[PDB]
């Protein structure tokens, strides 16, 4: 493990049943005695920030995060199958893990998946996506509702027609323009 005398910005560690990144830290020398570390840690699941103190002799546990470039192949009922671009290994993720991301995912999309000791900790989508309109009122600074091919519904300009391709921001869910 990591000694209190060997910290640096950016180390990844496991402590108190969470995984964390060292954002900043101070190496403390108390008078003439035994040194310790006060660290600022970011939780790699939630983004919360907490202070943690490591005392001399403690032996902090390292954490290895795997980051993989993957392709979404297709849905298999409740299973969503992704392929590793380098190895061709397949991973199956569930709708109940991907609840919000399914508003935007479509067959063929490239994603990045992060894993810690077998657990899946994140899926990073493209920043924008192109999705077709399956339901909206016909055309005849005002908006109307539209449903796209994933089931996602959003507000769009009055000129949009069923079958149009929309460019949508995956961060805030908003309409950008037509494709």
Curated annotation (Swiss-Prot):
GO terms for cellular component: cytoplasm. It is found in: Cytoplasm. Its main location: cytoplasm. GO terms for molecular function: translation elongation factor activity. Pathway: Protein biosynthesis; polypeptide chain elongation. GO terms for biological process: peptide biosynthetic process. CDD domains: S1_EF-P_repeat_1 (cd04470), S1_EF-P_repeat_2 (cd05794). Keywords: Cytoplasm, Elongation factor, Protein biosynthesis. PROSITE patterns: EFP. InterPro entries: Elong-fact-P_C, NA-bd_OB-fold, Rib_uL2_dom2, Transl_elong_fac_P/YeiP, Transl_elong_KOW-like, Transl_elong_P/YeiP_cen, Transl_elong_P/YeiP_CS, Transl_elongation_fac_P. Belongs to the elongation factor P family. Involved in peptide bond synthesis. Stimulates efficient translation and peptide-bond synthesis on native or reconstituted 70S ribosomes in vitro. Probably functions indirectly by altering the affinity of the ribosome for aminoacyl-tRNA, thus increasing their reactivity as acceptors for peptidyl transferase. This is Elongation factor P. It comes from Staphylococcus aureus (strain NCTC 8325 / PS 47). The lineage of its organism: Bacteria, Bacillati, Bacillota, Bacilli, Bacillales. The gene is efp.
């Amino acid at each position: 493990m990591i000694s209190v005398n060997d910290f640096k910005t950016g180390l990844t560690i496991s402590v108190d049943n969470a995984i964390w990144k060292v954002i900043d830290f101070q190496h403390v020398k108390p008078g003439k005695g035994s040194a310790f570390v006060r660290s600022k840690l970011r939780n790699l699941r939630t983004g919360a920030i907490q202070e943690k103190t490591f005392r001399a002799g403690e032996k902090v546990e390292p954490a290895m995060i795997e980051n993989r470039r993957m392709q979404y192949l297709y849905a298999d009922g409740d299973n969503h199958v992704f392929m590793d671009n380098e190895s061709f290994e397949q991973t199956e993720l569930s709708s109940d893990y991907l609840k919000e991301e399914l508003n935007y995912l479509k067959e063929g999309m490239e994603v990045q998946i992060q894993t810690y000791e077998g657990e899946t900790i994140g899926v990073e989508l493209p920043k924008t996506v192109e999705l077709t309109v399956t339901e909206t009122e016909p055309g005849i600074g005002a908006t109307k509702s539209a449903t796209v091919e994933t089931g996602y519904t959003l507000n769009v300009p009055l000129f949009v027609n069923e079958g149009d391709v929309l460019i949508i921001n995956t961060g805030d869910g908003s309409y950008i323009s037509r494709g």
